[PDB]
Amino acid sequence: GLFGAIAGFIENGWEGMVDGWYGFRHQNAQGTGQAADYKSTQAAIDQITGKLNRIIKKTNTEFESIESEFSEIDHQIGNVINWTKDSITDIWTYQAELLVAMENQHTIDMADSEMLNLYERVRKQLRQNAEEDGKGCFEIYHACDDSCMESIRNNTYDHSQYREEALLNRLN
Amino acid sequence: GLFGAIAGFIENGWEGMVDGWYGFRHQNAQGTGQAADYKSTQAAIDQITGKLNRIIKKTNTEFESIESEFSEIDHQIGNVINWTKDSITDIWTYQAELLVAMENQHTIDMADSEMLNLYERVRKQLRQNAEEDGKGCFEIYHACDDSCMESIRNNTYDHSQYREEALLNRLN
Amino acid sequence: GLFGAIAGFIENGWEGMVDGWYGFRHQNAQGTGQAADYKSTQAAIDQITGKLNRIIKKTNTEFESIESEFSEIDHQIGNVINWTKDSITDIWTYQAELLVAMENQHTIDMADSEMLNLYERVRKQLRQNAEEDGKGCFEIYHACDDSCMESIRNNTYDHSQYREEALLNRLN
Amino acid sequence: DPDKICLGHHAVANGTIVKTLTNEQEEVTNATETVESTSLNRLCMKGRNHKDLGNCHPIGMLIGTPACDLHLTGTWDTLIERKNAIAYCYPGATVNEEALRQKIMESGGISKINTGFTYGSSINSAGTTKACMRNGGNSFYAELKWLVSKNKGQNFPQTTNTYRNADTAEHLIMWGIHHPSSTQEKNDLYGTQSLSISVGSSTYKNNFVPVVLSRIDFHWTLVQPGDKITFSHNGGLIAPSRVSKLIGRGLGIQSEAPIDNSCESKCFWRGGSINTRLPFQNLSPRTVGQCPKYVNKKSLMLATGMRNVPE
Amino acid sequence: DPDKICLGHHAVANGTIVKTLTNEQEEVTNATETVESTSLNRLCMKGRNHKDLGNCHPIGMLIGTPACDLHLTGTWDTLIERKNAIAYCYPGATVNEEALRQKIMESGGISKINTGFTYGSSINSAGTTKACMRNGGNSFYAELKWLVSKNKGQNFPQTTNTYRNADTAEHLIMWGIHHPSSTQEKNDLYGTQSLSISVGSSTYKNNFVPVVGGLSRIDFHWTLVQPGDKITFSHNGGLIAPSRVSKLIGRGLGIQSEAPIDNSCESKCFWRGGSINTRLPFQNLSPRTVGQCPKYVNKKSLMLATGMRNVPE
Amino acid sequence: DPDKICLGHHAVANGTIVKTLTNEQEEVTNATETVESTSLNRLCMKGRNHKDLGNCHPIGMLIGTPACDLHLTGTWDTLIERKNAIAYCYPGATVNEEALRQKIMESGGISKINTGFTYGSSINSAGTTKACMRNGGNSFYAELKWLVSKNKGQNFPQTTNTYRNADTAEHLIMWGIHHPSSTQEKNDLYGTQSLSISVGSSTYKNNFVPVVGLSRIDFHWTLVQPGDKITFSHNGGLIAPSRVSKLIGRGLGIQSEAPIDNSCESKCFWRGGSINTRLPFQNLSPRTVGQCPKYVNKKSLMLATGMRNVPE
Ligand SMILES: CC(=O)N[C@@H]1[C@@H](O)[C@H](O[C@@H]2O[C@H](CO[C@]3(C(=O)O)C[C@H](O)[C@@H](NC(C)=O)[C@H]([C@H](O)[C@H](O)CO)O3)[C@H](O)[C@H](O)[C@H]2O)[C@@H](CO)O[C@H]1O
Ligand SMILES: CC(=O)N[C@H]1[C@H]([C@H](O)[C@H](O)CO)O[C@@](OC[C@H]2O[C@@H](O)[C@H](O)[C@@H](O)[C@H]2O)(C(=O)O)C[C@@H]1O
Ligand SMILES: CC(=O)N[C@H]1[C@H]([C@H](O)[C@H](O)CO)O[C@@](OC[C@H]2O[C@@H](O)[C@H](O)[C@@H](O)[C@H]2O)(C(=O)O)C[C@@H]1O
Ligand SMILES: *[C@@H]1O[C@H](CO)[C@@H](O[C@@H]2O[C@H](CO)[C@@H](O)[C@H](O)[C@H]2NC(C)=O)[C@H](O)[C@H]1NC(C)=O
Ligand SMILES: *[C@@H]1O[C@H](CO)[C@@H](O[C@@H]2O[C@H](CO)[C@@H](O)[C@H](O)[C@H]2NC(C)=O)[C@H](O)[C@H]1NC(C)=O
Ligand SMILES: *[C@@H]1O[C@H](CO)[C@@H](O)[C@H](O)[C@H]1NC(C)=O
Ligand SMILES: *[C@@H]1O[C@H](CO)[C@@H](O)[C@H](O)[C@H]1NC(C)=O
Ligand SMILES: [Ca+2]
Ligand SMILES: [Ca+2]
Fold this sequence. Notes:
The complex is a heterohexamer, with three copies of chain A and three copies of chain D.
Chain A: H1 5-9, E1 22-28, E2 31-36, H2 38-55, H3 75-126, E3 130-132, E4 137-140, H4 146-153, H5 159-171
Antiparallel strand pairs in A: 1-2, 3-4
Chain D: E1 3-9, E2 16-18, E3 26-28, E4 31-33, E5 35-36, E6 43-44, E7 50-52, H1 58-63, E8 74-75, E9 78-81, H2 97-106, E10 109-114, E11 123-127, E12 129-133, E13 138-139, E14 144-149, E15 159-164, E16 171-179, H3 183-190, E17 197-200, E18 205-208, E19 215-223, E20 228-233, E21 237-240, E22 242-246, E23 251-254, E24 259-260, E25 267-269, E26 272-273, E27 280-281, E28 288-289, E29 293-294, E30 301-303
Parallel strand pairs in D: 5-27, 6-24, 7-9, 9-23, 27-29
Antiparallel strand pairs in D: 2-3, 4-30, 8-10, 10-22, 11-14, 12-13, 14-21, 15-20, 16-19, 16-21, 17-18, 17-20, 25-26, 25-28
Bound molecules: a molecule of 3 linked components (NAG-GAL-SIA), a molecule of 2 linked components (GAL-SIA) (2 copies), a molecule of 2 linked components (NAG-NAG) (2 copies), 2-acetamido-2-deoxy-beta-D-glucopyranose (2 copies) and calcium ion (CA) (2 copies).
One calcium ion (CA) is lined by residues 79, 82 of chain B.
């Protein structure tokens, strides 16, 4: 897709993640774990909720009947009404198809961009202490316990604390 | 937003920047400075001007009166005209709302993309002489005077001149 | 443009590439070469084929005649028909202009995104063994023969094999 | 031996297909319908002062056909007309009939005002017919009067009747022209003289001549506040005893569906009611009220989630 | 020096200009047309049980003009009308003509039913004229009868003729009223007496009086006779009475065009100039089309981009 | 320790709210209105050969009512009708009135051609009335003639009048039918005989009979085709035309109460005045004429002309 993350450099989604749309899976000495990102999840959900508020509604225009159900209409006027109604139906059918096709394209790409923005946020956080593996993961070049993993997820990871250790492990 | 710069990793806009849409602020030994980027500003302005040219216009179709202002009309044909006018008005009201909502979404994301394209251009210029702080700035690892800052803004910065000095400062 | 590659950091297109939309050009001791990327080319073509399948069609609604070609029609109803037909034609003309303008914008930016996703894929393969030159090329800091170049294009380049040669060349 | 942190997104086992600009078969994590395909086979009349006319046709309310005796006056916000509803007991029809029906179906009520029209001793104003039965006896349209000669064969006298609209709103006045079957019948009821009915006001003028099986054709116009309408006639006029005032605004519905006072609805059609919150609808193009727009589509799924990329 | 690998895209020498949301002059590698500007100058009638009337006008099918002798009866899904088509051989015109023409062009066939009117020895029902020529000699409208007195100068008798609709669908009945040119011409055919025609059914009642004022003219009238209903013609000279009534069968596509027939090719969209067989969504030939058509737009061209930005070397 | 270069974007103190596909309350640096909600209460007629009829009704131009003496002939691209405009000085009305008024308001001018109708010695053709005052005393519809008997009580003779269309374009012919108030008046003007005004042509055919019951003159009309003749057979009751009309070309009909303004130009008009905007949409009225912005049910629709405003 447009931003290259969802159905892109991330190979597939996680069925195990049920408490969020985007999140993290880590690996260290203590073991493995999983956690959802609240901010990126709500950013996507609030944007979809906005679309629904705008699309799921009708006009308040009161329309009356111009065609009798139980008696014959004038033949001339009836043909004009039939031409007009079928023309109006073709416009609305076209507009409905275009609306939903356009919105679905935007919804998919919007969600893709939120995945990329979370990924880019973590990259700049880690700075020179990690390297990209190309699959949406960061190989971290220092000892990174559960509290250190939490600080990456919580956006309080200080790169300068581990920089000296990490640069030596990267150069090797 | 889609490209993650405006209302994203760049914390806020600059009210003090009055001569451009995008630009540079720097800090060195000498002091500080500010300057607007012309190329990115005009790229954003020209695209919006293009939208206004297409949107701010009316059709050349000549419409005549089908409803008398001062005399009566037959009630059936008056109802057919009223039904048709209300149907046409519902279409144009819907089209106007969709147009502006779609264009506003695109304008905001287009402007966001021009900010990111400028950011990416500067990242690649500096190469291995700087690092990203995550807030839209680049920490440059050599003495970078006003002439050197000007060369970054004007796209004439040569990374080779400062590479040995910069790499030593980065490794420490 | 939106993703900053086509008509952006890539200075121009290649008229010599007639076997694909996107591709590679290398330079090593053995010489120079050119090769198209099949996956990114088809991803762009399949999306444009999808647009054509949706756009290139008409409705199945049967419209009958409400205006006589060879004789006169009643004056009052003829005016209502003329107003209605001109209103419907203004709608469809407006819809056709908006459709084509919106789809052209998306097609152009979609093609730009596929270029960037190929560029970003190559960047992450090479990892710490190369650097970006700002013009869409990667300067590789190790001896990379035609088999090495083929492994970059075919997504089988293992960075860890060339890492020790590259880090020495980059740091001095 | 480096540690890892992996970014990722959710997925589901059972995804749903939606259409995009570039793809007909795009799988997403969730979606929702935008086209309503189901209708309630009932007229949802909760919160509506409604009138079910039943066997009464709207035009029958103004002239007073026996079927419409319980609907001669009233107020409403919704008026429901049924199939095969009776407007005319005696043979005939109204000129500009559909215009008149639509005008009644837009109203929010009907009230009646007496004309007070008087006729001399030479005229029998209480003419009745077997076609219009009321209480098991020969009767006539309740709001009209069949004027004929008291003595058979005698000339119907030259008569003048004027109604003034004393109200501050416009009144709807109706009358009929009897077109006799034969010359014998014409001479029996109205005499040998040549017949002519003139109706005139500020905003209206017309002349009627009875064509000489039998039929009473109806005509109508509006009398504005303060204006007078005059009837000049010498046989053939079916004169009004009362005129109508259409009060306010209301929603007209044509349907055979039964009424339900439990559910609410702002959109109606022949088949019933459409209560949906969705923007589009595929039941019928003929709807009334505040409705979702009709589309030629079974389904249009709107994506409410990202691309589903399963494991 | 380091080895290089460069990413890049294709391009062309001659690009094509398209419109986007932000740029009226955007060059792309290729584009395709969405508004059709060309038409085939033929009526493509393959897979259609069609009827080209030619010189016959639709109203002439009901009354039976000599030009419409092969179009009195038939079934069709498509009906083609032409310019300057002959409806009337004799001078005159139908009242409410356009509504009758439209109703016929919507139909999917016509069938005829006999009225069964028989006239006494005083009346001459085989009235003819040189205006309506058939098979070399003089003739009259095939579905009508010009009624005159057998003895010239004598009074036309008080005649009564009643058609009864025995079908379960409505029937279209047409008649004419002769308005003589001179009083001498009026007296020779219908006598000295004052003429008066009455036409009456349950949903119709009207009187028709001939008016005196080198041929005369016959003005036509029409109405619909409902199932189980009857229509009575009372008259004493002047009436051109129906020998047959019409029944419009089903529905069909009415086309008004000057283009010739072609049975080798198919189409679902037609106009005055011919057929439109394009796959494109829009079109700018004419706003007046019939069938399943592309939508008319006020545009010469609308190019849809089928490729990236063209950035040439 | 290290030097810095920072990338950023501009902002403003007072941003403006716009709607996007995804957000109702999106703040941007600048926006512009797409729906016009203000109108000039004046008819902007600059660069237009216009005719303000004033108190004259369009039908009055064809028949020649006193109020329409300045508008019997002319050319125009725009014709302006006003409220309570006078068509008939004498009581009465035209049959198929609205169709005629529409046809006149679509035209771009009018010219008059003489019928050349001559009458006998027993017909007084110069009948006038106090209802149609012109200059000082009694007068009549300029383009018509009230035909009555010269001697009071005598029978109006059986007259035949024929007009031939000698022009290449079609002509519009009008005539009236007097409907006397009483049988005494009937006898004084036209005599005791039974009246029958018959009108006939190739296209048109009709018969009229004066009903008896400060009187009335109802008008009728039809189109005479090029070359064709139209005949009038009558014996009293006919109000015959002295001239016929020819509608020249095409023009824009406006119905409005707003005053004229020859300084400003415009292409869109409504009852209240002119709509001069370059904006695509408009919420003033659904009844407009000319080349107009499309009516919408919206107070405002702000189009963004700038990025997201992220202040402070
Ligand atoms: C109309 C129809 O469908 N069929 C005709 C038969 O109705 C008709 O049969 C005769 O009808 C006579 C009707 O008598 C009244 C009535 O309608 O009740 C008696 C009323 O007092 C009289 N009212 C007034 C105000 O004049 C009324 C009126 O004159 C006529 O309806 C006007 O047309 O007539 C009666 O019952 C006879 O006994 C009955 O044979 C037959 C025979 O004429 O013809 C059908 O066409
Ligand atoms: C039914 C009938 O009477 N047919 C006549 C017909 C009619 O009488 C006539 O058309 C009614 O208007 O007239 C036919 O002759 C035409 C007639 O024209 C005169 O101008 C001329 O003076 C005559 O000699 C004669 O030609 C006709 O063919 O129309 C004869 C027909 O039998
Ligand atoms: C052509 C003609 O006869 N003009 C008369 C005119 C007509 O006779 C009349 O309008 C036909 O309805 O009448 C004029 O006098 C009107 C008449 O009105 C009475 O109420 C009044 O009592 C009389 O004194 C007289 O004014 C007219 O001006 O309308 C005279 C005109 O010559
Ligand atoms: C206008 O369109 C309606 C709907 O297509 C037509 O009504 C149908 O008429 C056919 C007769 O050919 C019937 O078989 C259908 O049952 C009718 N459908 C409905 C929903 O009523 C109608 O005939 C058209 N009117 C005119 C004047 O052409
Ligand atoms: C067509 O619509 C117009 C405008 O809504 C209707 O005119 C209004 O009628 C109501 C009466 O219910 C009045 O209160 C308004 O003052 C009228 N407004 C205007 C601008 O004229 C008109 O009645 C409708 N036509 C028909 C036949 O129903
Ligand atoms: C309708 O439009 C056609 C084509 O422009 C025009 O010739 C015709 O006069 C119009 N109809 C009426 C009734 O004005
Ligand atoms: C644009 O160019 C391509 C080149 O292969 C060709 O298919 C056609 O001319 C255009 N594309 C489409 C999809 O029509
Ligand atoms: Ca209404
Ligand atoms: Ca017109």
